[PDB]
């Protein structure tokens, strides 16, 4: 239930760095707390006692302390930087290595957008929290507490004033937090709405401009813009009040140190210089206390990231290969579904149910169906990307669950409708099937895929540059570039999704024609909703609402399969 995995493991190998940091900080805090004491003693023992030696010597001594605190502070910044960084690498690496082992079941749990933000934002948030802990979570509470101890040691009685400056501020902080927190959310809400309005007026400029209704969006943008002016003028009127109030109290306690400190000098209890010192320590407590205020506000957020990052490490891979799984030297390419029932999310209806069929090695089956008929689950089922609830999936009458994945998957190529390319050259992308592939082998399959002409019309042709995700090329160019990359693999099973439809300029038919020429000795599924796309196929599997409707040729199917007549009626 959940997981016993813990971020403290990642900081552990750097514990030397994680203690040198706060230790070099206590060097600084002390070095900082000594300066006002050495001022009282400068006056109360040296000005008011005519020893230039004292003043000279404790004047030199102050410099030597001031330089130490620097070696201290710098040192605590060098170390807490090593610690927080190393930690970040290590947590990020373990995170990535986790998302590489995830299955489609996993990447659906966290959504894919989230998965990223954890692997990037959160890793840096945590990386900050560590840096913070190791230096100013040690600094701020020592300067605070240390400052009080010094105050009391200077003069116990005057310390009473601390009980009249410290609670009003701690109340100020809590009151702001409990009352400011919902209003800054109310800012994000109104920011979002401005973004929304401005976005939809860019995404749909062509509609609103056509419908002669631009002024309705000006009216729609005003509501956003006013909802934003009010949510900010409010939430920022608190801040602009709290800070000066904070300064006043800090200033008003100064008064209480000079006033009450005026009676202790009279009644011969307290030296003049010890009042000077006391005022400094008063300050060093009041701003330190404020730092501790800002720190907590960071913690609660940095806290949330540690939850999400912990989830991703406590997630378990939904597709595991058995310890004694069969290796697959070759694969013939028969593909069979006994009573497969499949569903992506454990809340919805079965995308498939009792799906039966079998395909012989080298067949060219058309997996015809409309959207939602579960036709597109084939892509994810044959290479073990999801396991079905009931039923087997078999390749070469072997259960897929029973074979080494690197073997099974290395023999299947899928060409999904949504395609993704990777930052390097085109020739690097295409060799993703086989690195030892030769230029001619690469060109062979690029030609079948109908892309060798377009690639060659590039300034650097194959060695041209692919940008991230394939953002530089058009959808259809990505589609065929993905097909050409499938074909370099020499797959024994090859699954193409002719859905959605994008794109076709007639060159689609050219591809399926060239496929026949090389699928020779290889099974090929071709998930389509187009009838003509299904007519090149030697046989047509028809899916309707998750159950097989008919598995045969056009003429057989035209008779029985009521779904197939209905589809055929929709297209012709």
């Amino acid at each position: 239930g959940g997981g016993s995995k813990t971020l403290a493991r990642y900081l552990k190998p750097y514990w030397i760095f994680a203690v040198l940091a706060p230790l070099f900080m206590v060097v600084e805090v002390i070095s900082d707390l000594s300066q006002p004491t050495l001022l009282a003693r400068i006056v109360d023992e040296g000005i008011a006692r005519g020893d230039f030696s004292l003043v000279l010597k404790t004047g030199i001594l102050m410099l030597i302390v001031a330089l130490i605190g620097a070696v201290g502070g710098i040192g605590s910044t060098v170390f807490a930087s090593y610690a927080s960084q190393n930690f970040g690498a290590d947590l990020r690496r373990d995170l990535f290595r986790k998302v590489l082992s995830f299955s489609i079941s996993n990447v659906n749990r966290f959504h894919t957008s989230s998965l990223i933000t954890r692997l990037t934002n959160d890793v840096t948030q945590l990386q900050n929290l560590v840096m913070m802990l190791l230096r100013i979570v040690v600094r701020a509470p020592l300067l605070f507490v240390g400052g009080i101890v010094m105050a009391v040691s200077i003069n116990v009685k005057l310390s009473s004033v601390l009980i009249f400056l410290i609670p009003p501020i701690v109340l100020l902080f809590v009151w702001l937090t409990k009352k400011g927190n919902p209003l800054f959310r109310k800012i994000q809400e109104s920011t979002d709405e401005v973004n929304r309005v401005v976005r939809e007026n860019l995404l749909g400029v062509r509609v609103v401009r056509a419908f002669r209704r631009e002024e309705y969006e000006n009216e729609n943008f005003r509501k956003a813009n006013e909802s934003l002016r009010r949510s900010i003028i409010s939430a920022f009127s608190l801040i602009v009040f709290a800070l000066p109030l904070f300064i006043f109290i800090v200033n008003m306690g100064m008064i209480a140190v000079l006033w009450f400190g005026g009676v202790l000098v009279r009644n011969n209890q307290m030296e003049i210089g010890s009042i000077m010192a006391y005022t400094n320590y008063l300050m060093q407590i009041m701003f330190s206390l404020m730092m501790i205020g800002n720190i907590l506000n960071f913690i609660v957020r940095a806290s949330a990231s540690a939850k999400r990052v912990l989830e991703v490490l406590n997630e378990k891979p939904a597709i595991e290969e058995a310890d004694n799984a069969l290796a697959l030297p070759n694969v013939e390419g028969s593909v069979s579904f006994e009573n497969v029932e499949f569903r992506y999310f454990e809340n919805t209806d079965p995308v498939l149910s009792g799906v039966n069929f079998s395909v012989k090695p080298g067949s060219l089956v058309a997996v015809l169906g409309e959207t939602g008929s579960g036709k597109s689950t084939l892509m994810n089922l044959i290479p073990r990307l999801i396991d079905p609830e009931r039923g087997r999936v078999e390749v070469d009458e072997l259960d897929v669950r029973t074979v080494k994945l690197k073997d099974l998957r290395g023999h299947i190529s899928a060409v999904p409708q949504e395609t993704v390319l990777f930052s390097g050259t085109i020739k690097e992308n295409l060799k993703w099937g086989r690195e030892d592939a030769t230029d001619d082998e690469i060109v062979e399959a690029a030609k079948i895929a109908q892309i060798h002409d377009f690639i060659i019309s590039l300034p650097e042709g194959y060695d041209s540059r692919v940008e991230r995700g394939g953002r530089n090329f058009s959808g259809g160019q990505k589609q065929r570039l993905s097909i050409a990359r499938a074909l370099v693999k020499k797959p024994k099973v090859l699954i193409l999704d002719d859905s959605t439809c994008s794109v076709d300029p007639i060159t689609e038919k050219r591809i399926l024609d060239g496929l026949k020429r090389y699928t020779k000795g290889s099974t090929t599924f071709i998930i389509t909703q187009k009838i003509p796309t299904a007519l090149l196929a030697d046989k047509i599997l028809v899916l309707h609402e998750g159950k097989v409707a008919g598995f045969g040729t056009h003429k057989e199917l035209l008779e029985h399969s009521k779904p197939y007549r209905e589809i055929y009626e929709s297209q012709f």
Binding site: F52, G69, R212, V240, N251, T279, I412
Partner: protein, 583 residues
């Protein structure tokens, strides 16, 4: 963080003045504030002076009767200081939050007016991102960094003027950290920016590998790329590991180094000051006062440098924003006529259009459509049939040639009238994050909630609308994400109906459409087209057969033109484009 390069401002003084015009209607309120900061800044440099007295006056010569006279003087000065900070902030809040309210209005309106080209050319995100940041930069400097800069000038000169008129010797001792502070800060601020970027590089590369691999995870397993992707990550991570450290040290050594200057100051003021009191040259109270100016020459000097740069970056952000406000808007020429009630005939005369003006898109396109005639537009990717739509709504203009609806050239018709007689449904339809009823109404403002039902009935959309959770008032969050694509297409059709146009451009997808809706949307296409001129980018066999004309296209040129049976009987590019499809 660190600024990359100083902004290239094309004559800042010019843009400064124009910017200085946005805050002219609140001048008196702006002058009121600028004296608050003044007296608050002066009252600031006073308090350390008064504590010097109070020490010299009440404390050293024991005269503690004079005490509450002083502690009433301070105690009120304090109260006023925090009375101005409040006002010279609360006033600035509403004032600055008003200025950027206007610029949001002005910008968003230009959005409504600017050519559809500016949108089409640059990604949407990059424009919102750069505009909204250039606006926040204006706000922030206006409602803070200006007064924070100005204040610190007063407070600086103030605390210096006073410091010297008390004692010079000591003044020269304490100001000898201003050479330290500025020497340290700049050395350290070089190394920081260098490494900040060096790191920002390696790290953005890393998140590339991360975002791209998570997106196409499916594709990484299918190809077994895990070990290779892992090794690519690994190499970039150990890189990041070493730089991120250098970047992190150098960005966090200033506070400890600034403290070191804050304490070296406090030690020359105690060491010289206390050796100036032994010589009876200064008083102890005097020592306490310079302690009150010791930390006024470090971070306040640093807040000064950074606030300057922040102003500078805001001036540039203005210049960007100003330019967006200077873009030309679409104007209906003074002669432009309202559309006379015609059944709508269309004619292109040798039209040539290029988007980039370097790669021609349309070449010598000539034809003539007569009322009530359904026309089909066929061709490959880059045929140029998708470019026709934008030229009939005059989103773009024709380079060479001329278009004309009902005789009159489009560039002499009113853009308002034009787009009313012409309705449009595209493959990439657009819905709104409002209720269903609001979407269908959008086309016709003055529509009743019966015509909406009645016209939703005819186009087969009324059925599924009544089966939606909230019925007709169902909010389509994220623009209809919880809807079947067919159903969305159906809705987009129904709203073009209520706008009752006399010319209709169509483009109906078929790809994530279930067959059941398919029967519905094509029936609805029918009812929409009757009594309307209909140019169609068809993807269906049932429309290119029953068409009244078919303009086959290629390379932005007209290869053929005629009816179905004829164009098949000619056996041309239509035939190939047909028989290698529906054969």
């Amino acid at each position: 963080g660190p600024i990359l390069e100083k902004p290239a401002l094309k004559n800042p003084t010019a843009t400064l003045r124009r910017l200085l015009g946005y805050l002219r209607p609140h001048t008196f309120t702006l002058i009121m504030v600028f004296v608050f900061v003044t007296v608050s800044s002066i009252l600031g440099v006073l308090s350390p002076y008064l504590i010097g007295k109070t020490i010299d006056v009440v404390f050293v010569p024991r005269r503690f009767d004079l005490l509450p006279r002083y502690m009433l003087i301070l105690g009120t000065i304090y109260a006023l200081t925090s009375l101005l900070f409040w006002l010279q902030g609360k006033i600035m809040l509403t004032l600055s939050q008003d200025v950027v309210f206007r610029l949001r209005k002005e910008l968003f309106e230009k959005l409504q007016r600017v050519p559809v080209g500016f949108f089409d050319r640059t990604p949407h995100g990059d424009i919102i991102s750069r505009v909204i940041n250039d606006v926040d930069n204006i706000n922030n400097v206006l409602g803070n960094s200006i007064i924070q800069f100005f204040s610190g000038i007063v407070t600086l000169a103030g605390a210096v003027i006073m410091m010297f008129r008390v004692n010079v010797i000591l003044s020269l001792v304490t100001l000898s950290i201003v050479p330290l502070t500025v020497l340290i800060t700049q050395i350290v601020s070089s190394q920081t920016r260098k490494y900040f970027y060096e790191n920002q590089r390696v790290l953005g590369q890393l998140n590339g590998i991360i975002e791209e691999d998570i997106s196409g995870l499916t594709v990484i397993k299918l190809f077994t790329r895990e070990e290779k992707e892992m090794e690519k990550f690994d190499r970039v991570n150990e890189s990041l590991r070493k730089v991120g450290t250098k970047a992190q040290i150098f960005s966090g050594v200033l506070p400890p180094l600034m403290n070191m200057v804050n304490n070296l100051g406090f030690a020359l003021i105690s060491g010289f000051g206390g050796w100036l009191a032994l010589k009876d040259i200064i008083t102890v109270g005097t020592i306490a006062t310079f302690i009150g100016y010791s930390r006024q020459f470090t971070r306040p000097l640093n807040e000064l440098s950074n606030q300057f740069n922040m102003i500078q970056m805001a001036l540039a952000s203005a210049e960007r924003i100003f330019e967006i406000l200077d873009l030309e808007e679409e104007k209906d020429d003074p002669d432009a006529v309202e559309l006379r009630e015609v059944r709508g005939e269309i004619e292109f005369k040798n039209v040539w259009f290029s988007y980039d003006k370097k790669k021609p898109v349309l070449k010598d396109i000539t034809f003539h459509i007569k009322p009530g005639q359904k026309v089909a537009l066929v061709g490959p990717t880059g045929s140029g049939k998708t470019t026709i739509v934008n030229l009939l709504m005059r989103f773009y203009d024709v380079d060479r040639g001329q278009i004309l609806v009902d005789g009159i050239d489009i560039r002499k018709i009113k853009r308002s009238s034009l787009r009313s007689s012409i309705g449009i449904v595209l493959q990439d339809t657009i819905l709104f994050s409002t209720t269903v009823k609001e979407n269908l109404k959008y086309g016709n403002p003055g529509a009743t909630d019966e015509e909406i039902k009645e016209a939703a009935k005819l186009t087969h959309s009324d059925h599924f609308i009544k089966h939606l959770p909230e019925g007709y008032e169902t909010v389509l969050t994220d623009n209809g994400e919880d809807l079947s694509q067919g159903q969305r297409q159906l809705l987009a059709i129904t709203r073009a109906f209520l706008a009752n146009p006399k010319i209709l451009i169509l483009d109906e997808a078929t790809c994530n459409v279930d067959t059941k809706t398919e029967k519905s949307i094509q029936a609805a296409m029918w009812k929409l087209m009757e009594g309307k001129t209909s140019i169609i980018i068809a993807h269906r066999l049932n429309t290119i057969k029953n068409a009244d004309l078919i303009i086959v296209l290629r390379d932005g040129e007209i290869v053929e033109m005629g009816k179905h049976d004829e164009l098949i009987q000619k056996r041309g590019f239509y035939y190939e484009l047909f028989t290698s499809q529906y054969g």
